[PDB]
Design an enzyme around this catalytic site. Structure first.
Site: not given
Ligand SMILES: [Zn+2]
Length: 256
Positions: A60, A90, A92, A102, A115, A194
């Site tokens: 992911h 992590h 994104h 995000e 994050h 999220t």
């Molecule tokens: Zn995140």
């Protein structure tokens, strides 16, 4: 679940109905309505004793796991009540420099968003914390393309070792302090994870100042794979959920 046409954000609600909840994340931070909150106490980021354990690819997003067996790295102050222990981080990432984050600021998207996930120590452990409205505190940091970031080069060099899902690599020197911008000015609002389970257990603290990373560092992260080894390649890009309905929540600013 994923970010594809058939398993992406628009499909999540079927398995996770909370996806259509009242305090979902991310959101667009409208500076014309966000409001300064004098009741907010100074933000305290204690990462001097931070201890990362490994980097992983869970299919992911790029991830980092930290030793949360003690109060080595914690977040306090700001809108927070109590102590929140750092457990993971992590990234994104977008497929183009003009997208990737995000959260957005006045509709503006950044190239990526980092994050740093912390859990409220009043709950004993992450698992129990995630089940409470004030269980998690997540620090969001925007990334833009420009000058290279030293605190990220050591990770970028070994990304090939976690190219596909299910892979992990020991990494004891990922210092989260090296991913922080100069200013700690931020916006905060009650939200959620999220990604599924999308639990509404998060107090979001989104830093106003983005950090810079080089195009070369960005490119390396974009070479990670969503897929497992031996499977058709699917680059790990655009693994971001779009802005969700604010539903009259109030976004507070730490600055005037
Ligand atoms: Zn995140």
């Amino acid at each position: 679940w994923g970010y594809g046409k058939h398993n992406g954000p628009e499909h999540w609600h079927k398995d996770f109905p909370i996806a259509k909840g009242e305090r979902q994340s991310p959101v667009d931070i409208d500076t014309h309505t966000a409001k300064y909150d004098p009741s907010l106490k100074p933000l305290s980021v204690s990462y001097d004793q931070a201890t990362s354990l490994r980097i992983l690819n869970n299919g992911h997003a790029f991830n980092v796991e930290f030793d949360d067996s003690q109060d080595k790295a914690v977040l306090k102050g700001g809108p927070l009540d109590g102590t929140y222990r750092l457990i993971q981080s992590h990234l994104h990432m977008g497929s183009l420099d003009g997208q990737g984050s995000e959260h957005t600021v006045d509709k503006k998207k950044y190239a990526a968003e980092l994050h740093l996930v912390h859990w409220n120590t009043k709950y004993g452990d992450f698992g129990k914390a995630v089940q409470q409205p004030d269980g998690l505190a997540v620090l969001g940091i925007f990334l833009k393309v420009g000058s290279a970031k030293p605190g990220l080069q050591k990770v970028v060099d070994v990304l090939d070792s976690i190219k596909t899902k299910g892979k992990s690599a020991d990494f004891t020197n990922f210092d989260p302090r090296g991913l922080l911008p100069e200013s700690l000015d931020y916006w905060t609002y009650p939200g959620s994870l999220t990604t599924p389970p999308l639990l509404e257990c998060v107090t979001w603290i989104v830093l106003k100042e983005p950090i810079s990373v080089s195009s070369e560092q960005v490119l390396k992260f974009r070479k990670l794979n969503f897929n497992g080894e031996g499977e058709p390649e699917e680059l790990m890009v655009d693994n971001w959920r779009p802005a969700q309905p604010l539903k009259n929540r109030q976004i507070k600013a730490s600055f005037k």
